Design an enzyme around this catalytic site. Sequence first.
Site, PDB file in Angstrom:
ATOM      1  N   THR A   1     -18.113   0.092   1.157  1.00 34.16           N
ATOM      2  CA  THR A   1     -16.996   0.567   1.996  1.00 34.16           C
ATOM      3  C   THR A   1     -17.492   1.839   2.697  1.00 34.16           C
ATOM      4  OG1 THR A   1     -15.936   2.071   0.385  1.00 34.16           O
ATOM      5  CG2 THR A   1     -15.204  -0.260   0.348  1.00 34.16           C
TER       6      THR A   1
ATOM      7  N   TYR B   1     -11.432   6.601 -15.284  1.00 32.80           N
ATOM      8  CA  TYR B   1     -11.619   5.313 -14.606  1.00 32.80           C
ATOM      9  C   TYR B   1     -12.053   4.223 -15.624  1.00 32.80           C
ATOM     10  CZ  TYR B   1     -13.007   1.997 -10.986  1.00 32.80           C
ATOM     11  OH  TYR B   1     -13.147   0.875 -10.197  1.00 32.80           O
TER      12      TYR B   1
ATOM     13  N   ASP C   1       0.841  -1.173   0.000  1.00 30.10           N
ATOM     14  CA  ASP C   1       0.000   0.000   0.000  1.00 30.10           C
ATOM     15  C   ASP C   1       0.885   1.235   0.000  1.00 30.10           C
ATOM     16  OD1 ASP C   1      -2.213   1.983   1.163  1.00 30.10           O
ATOM     17  OD2 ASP C   1      -3.199   0.054   0.826  1.00 30.10           O
TER      18      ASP C   1
ATOM     19  N   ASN D   1      -4.434  -4.633  -7.400  1.00 27.40           N
ATOM     20  CA  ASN D   1      -5.684  -4.069  -6.905  1.00 27.40           C
ATOM     21  C   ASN D   1      -5.673  -2.560  -6.653  1.00 27.40           C
ATOM     22  OD1 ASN D   1      -8.364  -4.332  -5.158  1.00 27.40           O
ATOM     23  ND2 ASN D   1      -6.769  -3.392  -3.829  1.00 27.40           N
TER      24      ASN D   1
END
Lengths: 248, 248, 248, 248
Positions: free
Chosen positions: A190, A155, A36, A89
Site C-alpha cells: 500500500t 497488534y 469505513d 477488516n
Amino acid sequence: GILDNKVALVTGAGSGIGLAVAHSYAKEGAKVIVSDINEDHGNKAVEDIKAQGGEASFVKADTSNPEEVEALVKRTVEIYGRLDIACNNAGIGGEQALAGDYGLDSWRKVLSINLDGVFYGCKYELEQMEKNGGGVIVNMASIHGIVAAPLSSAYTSAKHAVVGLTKNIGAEYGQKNIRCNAVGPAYIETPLLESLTKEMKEALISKHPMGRLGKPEEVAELVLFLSSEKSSFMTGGYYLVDGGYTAV
Amino acid sequence: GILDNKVALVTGAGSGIGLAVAHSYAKEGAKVIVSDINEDHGNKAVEDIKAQGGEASFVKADTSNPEEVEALVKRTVEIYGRLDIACNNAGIGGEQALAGDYGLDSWRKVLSINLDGVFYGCKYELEQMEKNGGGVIVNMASIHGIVAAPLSSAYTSAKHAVVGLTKNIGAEYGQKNIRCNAVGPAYIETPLLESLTKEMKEALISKHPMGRLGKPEEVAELVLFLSSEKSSFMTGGYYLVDGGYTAV
Amino acid sequence: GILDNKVALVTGAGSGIGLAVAHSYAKEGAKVIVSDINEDHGNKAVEDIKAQGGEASFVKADTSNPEEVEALVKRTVEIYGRLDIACNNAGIGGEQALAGDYGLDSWRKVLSINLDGVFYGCKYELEQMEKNGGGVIVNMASIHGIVAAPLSSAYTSAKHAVVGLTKNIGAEYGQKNIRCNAVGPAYIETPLLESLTKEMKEALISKHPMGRLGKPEEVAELVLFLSSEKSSFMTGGYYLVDGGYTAV
Amino acid sequence: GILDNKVALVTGAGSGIGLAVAHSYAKEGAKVIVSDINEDHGNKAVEDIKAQGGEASFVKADTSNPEEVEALVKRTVEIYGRLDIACNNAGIGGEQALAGDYGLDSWRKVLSINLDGVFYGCKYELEQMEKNGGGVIVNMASIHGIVAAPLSSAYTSAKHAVVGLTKNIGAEYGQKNIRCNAVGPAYIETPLLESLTKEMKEALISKHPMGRLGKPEEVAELVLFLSSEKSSFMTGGYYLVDGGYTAV
C-alpha cells in the site's frame, strides 16, 4: 457471478485490502455495504464500484463502538433486506514500542479496534444471519495471528485473539448454517509501504520467500473464496496468504 | 533451592494454580509476593507458605487496573528489593454463551482481566527487570490459547492473545536477559470443580487422553521449570500441560 | 537424584545432544544405556559418565535396523532388568539440495534413520514398558518439525513425522501409564563453530532472538524435565528449546 | 475456464478426492493427466471427463516407485508438452493398531505411498516445472498432518511429513515461479464410510462441528483454488477443509 442475490458487508473498505474485498464481492454480484470511519474514502469506493457495474452503498462506522456496529448491520438490512456475507477488516497498526514501553492508551486503542471491533462485528452479524437462514464471516487476521511482530505486541495480541475468536465461532455455529474463517496476510503493498527506505523495503521483502510483497487483490481472492459456496466445508480455520513468510 | 534468593511475584495466587505456583516458588527458596484480589485467600496463602519454611508477603491487586499492577511491582521492590520472576496467573472464566449472544460487558470483563491484566503485569515487570539485570516471566495461558472452548469465546480470544503477547515479549527481549513463556493447562482439579455433576466431570475427563484431570501441582512444576535457569534457552514459547488434550 | 533407579536408554548418545542427555540422566541417578553407531564415541561417553559417579553401559545399534533396535531394548533389559525412560535422539542431517534435486538415496537414508528409527525405538520401547508398569519416552524432533529448513527437505519431513508420531503415542497410551513428548531444539553450538570466522557463526545467530545458539546441555535439561515425574501431566506434546526462533 | 490451457497431473485420480480434483481441473479447461495404479478406474475417469467436455488422458503409475513417477511426468510432457499443475493425492490408510503393535511392513507401506510417493511426485514435477517456467503443486495431506489419529500412527506420521515437505518446497522455490501448498481434509464421504454402521458414522460426524462429513467436491474446490492464479500469493501453507474438526 458467484455471489448473485447475496448481501455483503465489509468494514474498513475505503482502502487497501478492504477496498479490494469490496470490489471482488461487487464484481461477483453481491450488493455490498462499504463501511469505513472515513466518508471521503467510503464514498469514492462506492462510486468506483458503481462505475464498474456493481451495487454498493456507504455506511459510516467506527468498529470500536459497538453501538455503531449494531447500527451498521441494522442499516445493511434496511438498505438491502438481509446480510449473507461479512468481512471484518477494519484495523490499525498502532504505536511501535517494546512491550515494557508500550503505552496504556495505545494498547487499548489497538485492542478495541483490531479485536473488540471484530468481535462486535461478529456478534451483530451472527445475530442477523440467524434471522435470514445463515451466512459466512471472514475475519481479517494477519501472519501476526501466529508469529510475533517485534515492537507491535498489541497488534500481535489482537490478531492472535481474532484467530481464537474465529475458531470459537466456527465451532459454535457449525450446525447453524454459518461459517467463519480467518485470513492471515503477510505484508501487502500500500502507498504507506512505498514510502520506506529502499533498504527497509528490501529487508521486509527478504522475509517473504516469494521475494515480493503481496497485493491487496491477492488477499481479496482468498476472502472471496472463503465467503462463497466453494468453501462450503471450511469453517473455524485460519488461512495464510503470506508469500511463504510463516513456512520458515 | 533452585530459586534461592530470587524474588518472585504471582498474581491470582490465593487458590488453584496460582497457589501451587506460589508454593513451588517458595519451596525452591524464592521470596514470593502473593497477589490476589481476595485478601483472606491471599493472607491464608502467605501463612501456609511461611508455616512450610518459606518467605512470602501478601499484596492486594486487581490486575485489570493498570495502576494497581504498577503499584504491585513497586511494592514488590519495596518489600524485597528487586523482581526476578513473575507469573501472570490471575484470570476468570467468564460468561458462557453463544458468541452471537455474548454480553458486551462480559466480553470486556474477560478481556480486561485475562489479557489486559497480563499485559499490564508484563509491562511493569519488564520495566523493573531491566533495572535489576533481567529476569523471567511466565504467562498463564490455556489449551484455549490454541483450540476453541465452545461458549467461552472471550476466554478463548484472551488466551490466544496471551500466547501472542508471549511470543512478542520473548522475541523483543531476547538480548536483554529476559525470557517470557506461556503455559497451556487443560482442565485442572480444584475445589471450584465440585459444582460440576458427575456426568459433567466425566465429560471433561473424556477429553483428556490421560483419563483424568490435571492437578495444580503438575501445572506449577512446569511453571517452576520455565522460571528457573534450567530453561535458559527457552523463550517466546507455548508449553502444554494438557494430559494429551490437544494431541487429537 | 530425580531419576534414582530408573533405567534409561539414549540413542545416538556419543556426541552433541544425546551425550548431554545421557550425562543429565546419569547425573540424576539413572542407569543409562548409552547407544550409538560409533563404538569409540559410545565407550568414550560411558567412561566419561562413570568418571562423574554415574552408572552407564554401551550398546551398539544402528536405529535404521529394526532388529538392532529390538535387540537394543532386549539388551537393556538383560543389563538392568527393565526400561523406564527412552530418548530417541539418533539422527542425521542428510545432503543439502533443493527438493527437486534431492537424491533418492539421501531421502531414503534420512527418513530411515530420523523417522523409522524413532518409530522402531518407540515400538520396542513401548513393548517393554507395558511389561514393567509403564514409563516415559522423549522423541527428539527439531524446530524443523514445525518450520522448514530450506535445502534439508528430508530432515524437515522426518522431524515433522516425529511430532505426528509423538502425538499418536501420547494419545494412544494416555491410560497405560506411558507418556511420550517431543523436543524441538533450534541451532546448537558444536566443536566446529569455535573454528569459524565471526561471519560464519553470526549467520545462524541472527535467526535466534536470544542472540546466541543453544548449548546441548540446555536441550538436555528439557529432555530431563520431560523424562521425570515433574512432567506427569504432559503427554503427546511438542516442546521448543529454540531461543525464540519460531516465535517470529 | 480458470486453468485454460494448463497441463495438470493428478495422482490416485481413479476415485474419491483425486477423481473430483481431475473433474474440477478439466471443467476449468486444464488438459488433465489422470494417474492411478488401477487402469480400469483410470480409463473410466478419462471417459467420464471426456463425456462432460474435458480433455484428459490416462497414465498408469504406482507412486511408491520413483521410476514410475519419473516416467509419469516424462509421459505427461510427451502427451501435452509441459507440466503446469500437479496434485499429489494417491494415498492409503493402512493398518489400524497401537503404535507398539504396528507392523514393520505396514509402517513402511503407509510411509512409502503417503510420504515417499508425494516426495517422488514433487521431485520429478519440480524438475519439469523448472524447464517450463514454473508451476503449482498441491499436496494432499489430512487433518492428521496436525492432529493424531489413534491406531493410525503411520498415517499421521506420513501426513505430518507431507506438511513439512510442503513448507520446504514453498520456501525453497518461492522466487522460482513455483508454489506448493497442502490440503488438510477431515473425513470425506466415500463408498466405505457410507456403508459403515449408523452408530459409527454418527460418532465420526459428531467430531465435525458442521455435523456432517465432507464431500470430495468440497475438497476439490480448495485444490482448484490453490492450483489457480487466484492463490498467487499463497505458498508453503497448510489449508484445512475440515468442517471445524481441528478448531476444538
